Amino acid sequence: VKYTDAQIQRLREYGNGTYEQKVFEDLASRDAAFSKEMSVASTDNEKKIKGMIANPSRHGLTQLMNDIADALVAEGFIEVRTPIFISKDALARMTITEDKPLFKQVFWIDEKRALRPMLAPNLYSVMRDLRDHTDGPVKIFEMGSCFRKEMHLEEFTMLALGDMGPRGDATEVLKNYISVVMKAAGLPDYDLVQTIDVEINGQEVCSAAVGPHYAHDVHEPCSGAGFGLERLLTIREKYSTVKKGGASISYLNGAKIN
Amino acid sequence: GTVKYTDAQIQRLREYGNGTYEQKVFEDLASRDAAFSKEMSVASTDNEKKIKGMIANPSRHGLTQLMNDIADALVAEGFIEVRTPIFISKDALARMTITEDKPLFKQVFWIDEKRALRPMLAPNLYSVMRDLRDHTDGPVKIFEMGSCFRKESSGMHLEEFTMLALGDMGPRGDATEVLKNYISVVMKAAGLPDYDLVQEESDVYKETIDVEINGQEVCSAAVGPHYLDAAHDVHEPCSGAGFGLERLLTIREKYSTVKKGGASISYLNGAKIN
Ligand SMILES: Nc1ncnc2c1ncn2[C@@H]1O[C@H](COP(=O)(O)OP(=O)(O)OP(=O)(O)O)[C@@H](O)[C@H]1O
Ligand SMILES: Nc1ncnc2c1ncn2[C@@H]1O[C@H](COP(=O)(O)OP(=O)(O)OP(=O)(O)O)[C@@H](O)[C@H]1O
Ligand SMILES: [NH3+][C@@H](Cc1ccc2[nH]c3ccccc3c(=O)c2c1)C(=O)O
Ligand SMILES: [Mg+2]
Numbered sequence: 001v002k003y004t005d006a007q008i009q010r011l012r013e014y015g016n017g018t019y020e021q022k023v024f025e026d027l028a029s030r031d032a033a034f035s036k037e038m039s040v041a042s043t044d045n046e047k048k049i050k051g052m053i054a055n056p057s058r059h060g061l062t063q064l065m066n067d068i069a070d071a072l073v074a075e076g077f078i079e080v081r082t083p084i085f086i087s088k089d090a091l092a093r094m095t096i097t098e099d100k101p102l103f104k105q106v107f108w109i110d111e112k113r114a115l116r117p118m119l120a121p122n123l124y125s126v127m128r129d130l131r132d133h134t135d136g137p138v139k140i141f142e143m144g145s146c147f148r149k150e151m152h153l154e155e156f157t158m159l160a161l162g163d164m165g166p167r168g169d170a171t172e173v174l175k176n177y178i179s180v181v182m183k184a185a186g187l188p189d190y191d192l193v194q195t196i197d198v199e200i201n202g203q204e205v206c207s208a209a210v211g212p213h214y215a216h217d218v219h220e221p222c223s224g225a226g227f228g229l230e231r232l233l234t235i236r237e238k239y240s241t242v243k244k245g246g247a248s249i250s251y252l253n254g255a256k257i258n
Numbered sequence: 259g260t261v262k263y264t265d266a267q268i269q270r271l272r273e274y275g276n277g278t279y280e281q282k283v284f285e286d287l288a289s290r291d292a293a294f295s296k297e298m299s300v301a302s303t304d305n306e307k308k309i310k311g312m313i314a315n316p317s318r319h320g321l322t323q324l325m326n327d328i329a330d331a332l333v334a335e336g337f338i339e340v341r342t343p344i345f346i347s348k349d350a351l352a353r354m355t356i357t358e359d360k361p362l363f364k365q366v367f368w369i370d371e372k373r374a375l376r377p378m379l380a381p382n383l384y385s386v387m388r389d390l391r392d393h394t395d396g397p398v399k400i401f402e403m404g405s406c407f408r409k410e411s412s413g414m415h416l417e418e419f420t421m422l423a424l425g426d427m428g429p430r431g432d433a434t435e436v437l438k439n440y441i442s443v444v445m446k447a448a449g450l451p452d453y454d455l456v457q458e459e460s461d462v463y464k465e466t467i468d469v470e471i472n473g474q475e476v477c478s479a480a481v482g483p484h485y486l487d488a489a490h491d492v493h494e495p496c497s498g499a500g501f502g503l504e505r506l507l508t509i510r511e512k513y514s515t516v517k518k519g520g521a522s523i524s525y526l527n528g529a530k531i532n
């Protein structure tokens with residue numbers, strides 16, 4: 001037998017082991033193993049919190065953002081920051097209209113504005129405006145919170161990068177940007193799947209595309225990529241749920257504080 | 259003379275310019291208007307040069323850099339950096355005494371009947387601090403940097419702004435002296451070592467110690483008060499402070515409005531891109 005569904009949830013509350021694979025010969029040995037792993041998880045958790053208090057660090061998600069950002073600046077990307085509020089018109093230009101499944105996921109603030117569910121609308125706007133000021137390509141990125149009604153969080157942190165303007169072998173260039181990010185995040189091993197998706201062990205962590213010309217008749221060449229940063233951190237740190245590494249009032253850097 | 263730029267001219271000058279236009283005086287309307295024309299061209303020229311420099315030398319964002327500079331200083335002092343949700347509950351607001359009758363309540367962006375965009379970081383920081391007290395007998399020192407939201411209406415006010423808030427529960431030594439010292443750490447790390455501390459009235463905290471630069475508030479801080487601590491199950495000396503990071507950046511970089519240094523689709527690091 002295996003751990004019961006309820007035992008798995010109990011083990012994952014304080015523990016970050018891999019519990020779903022354990023197999024046992026009878027209920028007695030399952031229950032003995034469970035008691036031991038619960039005790040170890042809880043004590044390990046307590047020690048980890050005591051260590052953060054004794055030797056505080058930058059938050060794990062902030063650190064991951066800084067590691068990636070310094071890699072992208074070194075590659076010539078400008079960091080931008082855009083508003084969390086976006087307009088209904090802006091969503092509709094992303095083709096996010098009443099009929100699109102994503103539309104039902106939007107948090108509205110009033111009749112005309114919403115919490116952004118992705119960074120792309122704002123980033124494309126900023127890229128196009130920066131291209132008005134130069135003959136060369138423009139490469140930018142943003143990291144920030146996005147929101148969707150719902151490895152899913154209602155508030156999650158997206159990294160979005162974009163490259164607009166003259167570029168040769170766009171697809172190879174985009175794959176290299178993905179490499180830069182994944183390597184800077186400490187996740188060098190990953191699969192590319194088909195638009196390009198990045199997966200680790202079947203779990204999508206990025207969606208990227210060349211030429212998303214989805215207002216103007218004539219477009220600049222453009223490519224971009226969006227990464228879920230809590231997902232990357234969860235996979236790298238081997239946290240047993242996606243709720244432990246990001247923003248929380250129950251978890252702090254993988255450890256449960258209550 | 260006594261003639262100033264008109265209010266509309268000041269707004270037009272500040273759109274692309276970061277000069278100090280409100281100080282200019284003129285003898286008559288003709289001279290005012292000629293100066294306006296000249297200073298508008300200068301402002302746009304200077305703006306274009308800044309944009310071209312940013313394109314030629316890609317960099318981290320100014321607000322992100324300020325956040326990193328302050329955060330590293332606070333971690334060096336033993337503060338834990340936390341990140342908490344932007345969503346908070348109506349009950350959490352009530353525990354801060356932000357209820358239907360209070361003016362700040364009118365400023366809250368509601369997401370549904372029971373949840374709002376946080377207008378301040380204290381509700382979540384109080385929760386995390388109290389839980390961390392369960393794991394130590396010593397001081398509990400935490401901070402968060404992140405977006406807060408208020409309906410506003412406009413000088414030095416944004417609807418979305420970035421607060422740095424810190425909390426210190428059970429400090430070693432006098433709570434007010436410790437608070438003043440951590441304010442000093444933040445302000446020096448921000449590159450703004452010259453500031454005044456001024457006692458100010460508060461609906462939530464009764465009285466705050468505010469950080470003011472040339473009369474402009476950039477931080478409110480408070481020890482307690484006791485009723486507010488006890489509402490969050492805190493029963494020991496406690497203090498905290500909340501800094502407006504865009505206001506700090508605006509003053510340090512001498513930007514002419516508070517809309518230029520933070521998140522924007524029109525401005526990038528003090529320059530207008532459209
Ligand atoms: N609710 C969410 N919680 C956490 N991360 C998310 C969430 N939605 C998207 N992401 C991350 O943001 C990236 C942006 O991609 P995209 O908007 O296409 O996601 P998606 O197709 O809705 O994802 P999924 O199928 O996993 O729900 C996703 O690859 C994922 O890494
Ligand atoms: N709308 C806003 N835009 C930008 N910064 C803000 C805004 N509201 C508050 N802040 C910053 O957050 C800090 C802590 O918030 P606090 O509640 O004390 O502000 P406040 O007393 O309402 O400010 P003010 O009187 O300027 O409106 C303030 O000192 C200020 O620097
Ligand atoms: N008046 C402003 C700024 C302010 C002042 C004192 C505070 N004291 C605290 C103590 C413990 C935990 C959090 C806080 C907190 O953020 C806090 C914030 C506001 O709250 O927005
Ligand atoms: Mg989805």
Ligand SMILES: [Mg+2]
Pocket residue numbers: 204206207
């Ligand atoms: Mg996807």
Ligand SMILES: [Mg+2]
Pocket residue numbers: none
């Ligand atoms: Mg106010």
Ligand SMILES: [Mg+2]
Pocket residue numbers: 475
């Ligand atoms: Mg005030």
Ligand SMILES: [Mg+2]
Pocket residue numbers: 466468475477478
């Ligand atoms: Mg104040």
